[PDB]
Amino acid sequence: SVDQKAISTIRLLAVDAVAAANSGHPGAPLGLAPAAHAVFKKMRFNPKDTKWINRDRFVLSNGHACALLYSMLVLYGYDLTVEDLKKFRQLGSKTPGHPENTDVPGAEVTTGPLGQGICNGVGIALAQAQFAATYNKPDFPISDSYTYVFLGDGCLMEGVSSEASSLAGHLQLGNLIAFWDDNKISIDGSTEVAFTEDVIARYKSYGWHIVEVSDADTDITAIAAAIDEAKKVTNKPTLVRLTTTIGFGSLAQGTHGVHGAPLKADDIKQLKTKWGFNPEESFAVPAEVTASYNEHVAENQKIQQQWNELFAAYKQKYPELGAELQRRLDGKLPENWDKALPVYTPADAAVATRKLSEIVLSKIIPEVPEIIGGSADLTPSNLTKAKGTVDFQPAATGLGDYSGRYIRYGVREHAMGAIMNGIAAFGANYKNYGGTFLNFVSYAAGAVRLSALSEFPITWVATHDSIGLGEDGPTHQPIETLAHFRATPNISVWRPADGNETSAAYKSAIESTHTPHILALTRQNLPQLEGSSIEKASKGGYTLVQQDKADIIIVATGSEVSLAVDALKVLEGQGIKAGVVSLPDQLTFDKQSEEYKLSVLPDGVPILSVEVMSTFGWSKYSHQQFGLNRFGASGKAPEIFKLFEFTPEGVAERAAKTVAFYKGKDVVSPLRSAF
Amino acid sequence: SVDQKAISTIRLLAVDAVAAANSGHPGAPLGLAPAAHAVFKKMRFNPKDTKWINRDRFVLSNGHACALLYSMLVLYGYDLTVEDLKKFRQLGSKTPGHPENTDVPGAEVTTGPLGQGICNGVGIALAQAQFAATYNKPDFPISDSYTYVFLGDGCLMEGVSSEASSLAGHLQLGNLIAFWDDNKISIDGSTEVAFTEDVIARYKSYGWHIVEVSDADTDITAIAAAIDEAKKVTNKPTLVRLTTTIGFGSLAQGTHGVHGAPLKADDIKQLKTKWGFNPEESFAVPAEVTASYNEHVAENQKIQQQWNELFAAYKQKYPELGAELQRRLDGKLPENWDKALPVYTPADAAVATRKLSEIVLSKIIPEVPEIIGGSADLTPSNLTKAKGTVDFQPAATGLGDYSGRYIRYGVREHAMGAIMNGIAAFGANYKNYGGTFLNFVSYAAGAVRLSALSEFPITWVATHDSIGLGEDGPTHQPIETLAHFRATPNISVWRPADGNETSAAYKSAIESTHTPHILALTRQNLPQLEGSSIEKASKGGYTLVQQDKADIIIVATGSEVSLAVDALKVLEGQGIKAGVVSLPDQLTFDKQSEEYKLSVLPDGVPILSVEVMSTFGWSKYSHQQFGLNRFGASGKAPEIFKLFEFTPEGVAERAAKTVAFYKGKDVVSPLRSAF
Ligand SMILES: C=C1[C@H](CCOP(=O)(O)OP(=O)(O)O)SCN1Cc1cnc(C)nc1N
Ligand SMILES: C=C1[C@H](CCOP(=O)(O)OP(=O)(O)O)SCN1Cc1cnc(C)nc1N
Ligand SMILES: [Ca+2]
Ligand SMILES: [Ca+2]
């Protein structure tokens, strides 16, 4: 039949792509081609408009199987061709070895690190539910789309998927439909060696619906029926167990050897002949398959055409909501939204930057509907919920509604990070955030790095940033954390010192379209600084205290800026004139012009950095570094700062030693380099 | 009764400790005191010998509840007193706000970051099973101890605990007995807001046995009976559901407010009077409680006395095994074990450092019985299994035996990291390792940081270290990873360049007693270097190519050392004389004498670093840094190196620019500093 021919075409495109690269993963593509065919025939999508907001989304969580995804995208006439498949895994191609949303048309997210994609799918589904609850009206199903996810044994072993699956079951996300490739094979061989749990029983315990397809190597009727069944269960996410043979059809089917290396040439020949293809031909695309797939595309395009008319009618019937929706689909924030940001003066009281963050959120959430967010069981510590908002919960629980704006993630940092990526991936200008203690952002490193690689504007509200948290002690006190994330490409790591800097950090985070943000915030109160403003802090680094005859400049962040200002006064009594630079975000600063940066960190003066965490990175901006390169301590925070000499006198001592060290030397800016 | 009085004493010691600090967590201590009393009465331990190898182990995974643990340790006469409890959460005390194994006698592991302790308990139990299988003989139960773990809702939400619980069920670890504090309260309030899964059904799906105690606020008879029941189930770990009231007895019992802040003074008064204590007194220890607990200690000490005689008889009956066991309990490796390390010459073939690592393991595993390890589903990629070893599996599976030495962790990096910490915590000189790709060590950051803080000599075999892996692309290629771990205190991050350096890295990793190791290893082949040796590489950094008239020194690691040597030859044709330094471990290098370090990185010459990852940290050792501060690419590895100019010519160009940049300048070693 044409469906059989399409499945064979998909299988053989994937195997031929792996063969051409002499690299990659043929096994799962062979096993999942029937399911991919069946799912894409149920999905609504436009290959010519990858951003249609009411499309169904597909996520390949087992991202090593991407030759399968690329084959589907090529067959459906996305902006990806057979010529691109021939360049699978080749430098610069549109067909990288794991799918990247920035590079691959029709890749919703970046997968490959196992477990991430299913969590991203939870976030896409969460966003769809929130979006539909916000905009749908009687006779106006603006949003009614599904989220389809493929995942394998590896994703099911990774703890992040357990976190997200527990939460998705709690949230009753009935438009999520996941498919487990139950092939009993991983890299180390049989799943009997390490993965003998009853997966289905576990998913029932989370509140998921289950459909089992015992013959998923051939039974596309049953796979389609499983989707129909899942769509009837509106209050539970569904897991479809696809019992498959890894590498189906290969001489090596059902073995670990077919997982992750190219097939032998003779094996590819026998595949082709068994399925009616020419063993001498590669990258065959039968025109009847193209015709069949084109029919589905044309039908989907008529569905989108009708949706566009529905949207026009919605704008007439609901003028305010319609204009809001249009603005969001255009990628634009509300005009002058930033006038809601709080502004402070040096006469205002000292405030912890976690509390300043609460105040910002309180002002901007009512002004910017596309802001949603939550905390990983730290709501009263991170201060992430605006008073008078409702939680995102299924109404059946009585605990919230899908129109709610605040997510109770539970103690699930890693899944929170990957769910945030899915919310961002949904689109519609969502600007979403997640709170935890800074030290436990590290639990989510797998997802955070993907936020950076995927260019998603997510925000971590990362409180309790240092030894300033005090008594909880060294298991809770960051040392390496900012260095880790600053060393990752494309992460904006804001460590605001005061109220105006906190507002600048949020301005950056909310305006972002391609860069994730981490906001490192204090437990403890900090003074409002003389010289700070949103305008200057928005440059990432700025001169707080200008001293035209400086003997030294002190560059600092966060809680250490006030310390530097106090040290300046001690130094004046020692006959040393200092300037102060505040560097709330190194990435934003780095992106400023060379001339601006040199105005902040000039030639001809020693520069000392002060930040109560690792000194890594700081030589970009300073000649000498005063930091904390050992673990912390459990005690009252002021006593810990005194122990480690992060005091005005301790900073002054090191500044005076820095001045003396450079006596008789020629000093150029740390910004200079040889190449 | 005296048992009732003991429970009240525990409760009130914990509340009084929190009160004195005006900081900490009274709720879970109040709720878990009956269970703590019951469990410690079943446990075999010696407060005067915390390292008795056949002790039962206790782990408080919900480490914020540590006022409970400290109270137990004080009451049982560990090296911790009421005076230490009065200093709870105070700078420098033996009673920090979360338990630290380095600081607290009777704390087996460092907990507080949720989810870790239960995984550590899995590792303690894994080690006990392996140890017993290795040494026990008929009439000689050298090892027969249990592992008891307390954990809360937060630990059950963290994905790492799901990973470890799936694996522990697979491994049939019947001497593991965990207790869930089922109090339905977390920081954000009721567990109904975020944690509605059927936990018991999930644990059954992993293959655990369940006992439920519905009245754990009072029913110590049932808690003791649950332990007895668990001990009869020898082929399944057991989860005991303790239904408790958080803060039991407080006016605020059953509320989130009792989780994490001191009780009100009037609340403490009513607790004391309801339980027969003097509301005017704090830190009361009734002498009848001390007497009861002392009876149990005395009985346990007689058990250890008899074990010591059993061990003496074992040494007579099994002379070789007995001497091996004695050596391990003394903390000593086999005499001259390091003579098994492979040694190479520059005439030997190029080899990838992952394969060199395989070869080392092949030679040292037969020589050092306390080495065990595994991989997170990457055995044929990381090359972590020695041919001719058996896997650690329950014999009932037919897939291995508990005497086996190789662990199939599955796709569970984070739990692998925390399980390794538990294996190390067991003691008996275990030197254990875990393989994954370097980029996915980041999934386990929570546990890795605890390896460093806990001072455990665990080893990550972290292969596929860079863009040198090629086609899998940027989702797999480390950039920030070494900077992250190098910035963490107390992590030895070895990036060996060749065969001799790989042997030095293992010598360090296996000899370690207080420092975790990460070995960053290549996919791709590297040449054997002229000038390398185990002796020189053991210094962490060394002069590979000495040039007395150097115009520049190039410092490099790993795959970039050979690149630097090739660049030296290009530079010679440009009239520039270079030296080369190899820096296989920055931490080991930093620990050498100042004079040794200056012999490697002298004054008076520009120094350029070369490493194909982040430049963070490298200014410790160099004036200019050539690194990779952007994400990678999917293609054949040599083409990626060419794209980014990590070629002999690209390095030479940057070296020549470095020489020119310092013309006319006075250059001092990067090792110099102002303070
Ligand atoms: C361990 C593996 C994989 C085996 C996956 O087994 P599956 O059953 O999911 O796949 P199948 O055999 O059915 O094709 S693929 C690559 N990989 C390394 C890897 C490790 N850790 C993380 C976090 N991300 C990764 N990609
Ligand atoms: C979110 C929390 C905790 C609430 C724990 O709730 P439980 O039910 O376990 O405790 P109970 O209320 O019953 O006392 S305690 C502190 N903490 C922050 C925290 C976050 N992330 C990680 C990884 N480690 C942490 N310690
Ligand atoms: Ca599989
Ligand atoms: Ca709880």
Q: For chain B, what are the domain ranges?
A: 1-326, 327-538, 539-675
Q: Which residue of A has its CA nearest to B167?
A: A194
Asked if residues B671 and B597 have their Cβ atoms less than 8 Å apart, the reply is: yes
CA distance B368 to B356: 18
Q: Is A476 on the interface with B (CB under 8 A)?
A: yes
CA distance B210 to B438: 37
Bridge partners for A151 per DSSP: A180
Cβ under 8 Å to A: B residues 101-120? 110-115
Which of B102, B188, B190 is the best substitution to test chain A (most A C-beta atoms within 10 A)? Answer: B188
CA distance A225 to A211: 9
Helix axes A413-426, A116-135, angle to 10 degrees: 50
Asked if residues A478 and A484 have their Cβ atoms less than 8 Å apart, the reply is: no
CA distances from B402 to A408, B217, B408 (A): 42, 37, 13
Neighbouring C-alpha atoms within 13 Å toward the C-beta of B668:
10
Q: Which two tokens stand for residue B428?
A: 């008996």
A100 is in an annotated binding site: no
Q: Tokens 């972290």 belong to which residue? A: B462
Bridge partners for A58 per DSSP: A148
Cβ under 8 Å to B: A residues 358-377? 375, 377
Asked if residues B65 and B56 have their Cβ atoms less than 8 Å apart, the reply is: no
Which residues contact residue A400 at a Cβ distance below 8 angstroms, ignoring those fewer than 6 apart?
A: A390, A391, A392, A393, A394, A406
Asked if residues B245 and B34 have their Cβ atoms less than 8 Å apart, the reply is: no
CA distance B38 to B219: 10
CA distance B404 to A672: 57
Which residues contact residue A224 at a Cβ distance below 8 angstroms, ignoring those fewer than 6 apart?
A: A38, A41, A42
CA distances from A11 to A20, A99, B117, B164 (A): 14, 18, 45, 36
The alpha-helical segments, DSSP class H, found in A330-473 are 353-364, 379-382, 413-426, 438-441, 445-454
3-state secondary structure of B155: helix
Helix or strand run (H / E) with residue A641: helix A637-643
Within 10 angstroms of residue B51's Cβ, the number of other Cβ atoms is 10
CA distance A606 to A350: 31
Question: In this structure, which ligand is nearest to the CA of A246?
Answer: 1
Handedness of CA A535, A541, A545, A550 (dihedral sign): negative
Report the DSSP pairing between strands B542-545 and B578-582.
antiparallel
CA distance B218 to B1: 13
CATH topology of domain A1-326: Rossmann fold (3.40.50)
| Pocket lining for ligand 1, CB < 6 angstroms | A 27-28, 62, 64, 112-114, 152-155, 181, 183, 185-187, 246, 259; B 377-378, 411, 440, 443
Active site residues of B: 413
For the residues of A512-561, what is the DSSP string, one character each? -SS--EEEE--SSEEPPPTT--HHHHTTSSEEEE--TT-SEEEEE-THHH
For every residue of B615-634, which 3-state class applies, written as one string?
CCCHHHCCCEEECCCCCCCC
Which residues contact residue B632 at a Cβ distance below 8 angstroms, ignoring those fewer than 6 apart?
A: B467, B473, B474, B477, B479, B640
Check B111 against A157: CB less than 8 A apart. no
CA distances from A201 to A179, A190, A206, A208, B591 (A): 15, 20, 9, 10, 52
Going by C-alpha positions, the residue among A593, A512, A581 that lies closest to residue A545 is A581
CA distances from A344 to A145, A530, A531, A533 (A): 44, 10, 11, 8
Give the residue, out of B15, B64, B259, with the most ligand 2 atoms within 8 A of its beta carbon, to mutate for a pocket test: B64
Asked if residues A172 and A207 have their Cβ atoms less than 8 Å apart, the reply is: yes
Amino acid at A301: Q
Q: Is B167 on the interface with A (CB under 8 A)?
A: yes
3-state secondary structure of B490: coil
Handedness of CA A213, A216, A219, A221 (dihedral sign): positive
Report the DSSP pairing between strands A351-352 and A525-526.
antiparallel
Q: A389 C-alpha to center of ligand 2: Å?
A: 24
Which residues contact residue A188 at a Cβ distance below 8 angstroms, ignoring those fewer than 6 apart?
A: A194, A256, B375, B377, B378, B379, B380, B408, B410
Helix or strand run (H / E) with residue A230: helix A220-232
Within 10 angstroms of residue B170's Cβ, the number of other Cβ atoms is 23
A259 is in an annotated binding site: yes
The C-alpha angle B154, B155, B156, rounded to 5 degrees, equals: 90
Find the length of chain B. Answer: 675
Please list every residue in chain A whose beta carbon sits closer than 8 Å to the beta carbon of residue B196: 169-170, 207
Asked if residues B519 and B494 have their Cβ atoms less than 8 Å apart, the reply is: yes
Within 10 angstroms of residue B290's Cβ, the number of other Cβ atoms is 15
Going by C-alpha positions, the residue among A377, A285, A107 that lies closest to residue B153 is A377
Asked if residues B342 and B363 have their Cβ atoms less than 8 Å apart, the reply is: yes
Find the length of chain A. Answer: 675
Q: Which two tokens stand for residue B464?
A: 């596929």
Q: Is A480 on the interface with B (CB under 8 A)?
A: yes
Going by C-alpha positions, the residue among B476, B659, B487 that lies closest to residue B586 is B487
Asked if residues A71 and A40 have their Cβ atoms less than 8 Å apart, the reply is: no
**Strands lying side by side in the sheet with B176-182:** B57-60, B147-151, B176-182, B238-243, B209-213
Neighbouring C-alpha atoms within 13 Å toward the C-beta of A394:
19
Which residues contact residue A87 at a Cβ distance below 8 angstroms, ignoring those fewer than 6 apart?
A: A20, A93, A94, A95
Asked if residues B556 and B581 have their Cβ atoms less than 8 Å apart, the reply is: yes
Cβ under 8 Å to A: B residues 73-92? 89-92
Check B154 against A411: CB less than 8 A apart. yes
Report the gap between the CA of A126 and the closest CA in chain B (Å): 14
Asked if residues B497 and B584 have their Cβ atoms less than 8 Å apart, the reply is: yes
Amino acid at B192: E
- Residue B114 sits at φ, ψ, to 5 deg, of -65, 150
Distance of CA A288 to the CA centre of its chain: 39
Q: Which two tokens stand for residue A54?
A: 């009411």
Handedness of CA A416, A418, A424, A426 (dihedral sign): negative
Q: Tokens 């754990």 belong to which residue? A: B216
Please list every residue in chain B whose beta carbon sits closer than 8 Å to the beta carbon of residue A614: 487
- The resolution, in angstroms to one decimal, equals 0.9
Bridge partners for B240 per DSSP: B179, B211
Amino acid at A672: R
| Pocket lining for ligand 2, CB < 6 angstroms | A 377-378, 411, 440, 443; B 27-28, 62, 64, 112-114, 152-155, 181, 183, 185-187, 246, 259
| Torsion (CA) B53, B54, B55, B58 in degrees, nearest 10 | 80
User: What is the Rg, in whole angstroms, of the alpha carbon atoms belonging to chain B?
Assistant: 28
Q: Which two tokens stand for residue A544?
A: 């707080």
Active site residues of A: 413
The C-alpha angle B125, B128, B131, rounded to 5 degrees, equals: 150
CA distance B401 to B390: 7
Bridge partners for B238 per DSSP: B177, B209
| Torsion (CA) A502, A505, A509, A512 in degrees, nearest 10 | 150
Which residues contact residue B535 at a Cβ distance below 8 angstroms, ignoring those fewer than 6 apart?
A: none
Q: State in words which class domain A539-675 has.
A: alpha beta
* CATH number for the domain running over A327-538: 3.40.50.970
Q: Tokens 């008594």 belong to which residue? A: A471
CA distance B643 to B663: 29
Q: Is B418 on the interface with A (CB under 8 A)?
A: no
| Torsion (CA) A92, A97, A99, A104 in degrees, nearest 10 | 30
CA distance B150 to A225: 45
Neighbouring C-alpha atoms within 13 Å toward the C-beta of A293:
28
Amino acid at A135: Y
The C-alpha angle A586, A591, A594, rounded to 5 degrees, equals: 105
Check B476 against A98: CB less than 8 A apart. yes
User: For A196, which of B113, B170, B199 is closest by C-beta distance?
Assistant: B170
Please list every residue in chain A whose beta carbon sits closer than 8 Å to the beta carbon of residue B159: 158-163, 412, 414-415
CA distance A442 to A218: 43
Decide whether B327-538 matches B539-675 in CATH topology: yes
For the residues of B159-208, what is the DSSP string, one character each? HHHHHHHHHHHHTT-TTEEEEEEE-SEETTEEGGGT--S-HHHHHHHTT-
Asked if residues B102 and B76 have their Cβ atoms less than 8 Å apart, the reply is: no
Q: Tokens 């254990």 belong to which residue? A: B432
Asked if residues A552 and A606 have their Cβ atoms less than 8 Å apart, the reply is: yes
Amino acid at A195: F
**Strands lying side by side in the sheet with A607-610:** A542-545, A578-582, A552-556, A607-610, A624-626
Distance of CA A193 to the CA centre of its chain: 33
CA distance B211 to B304: 30
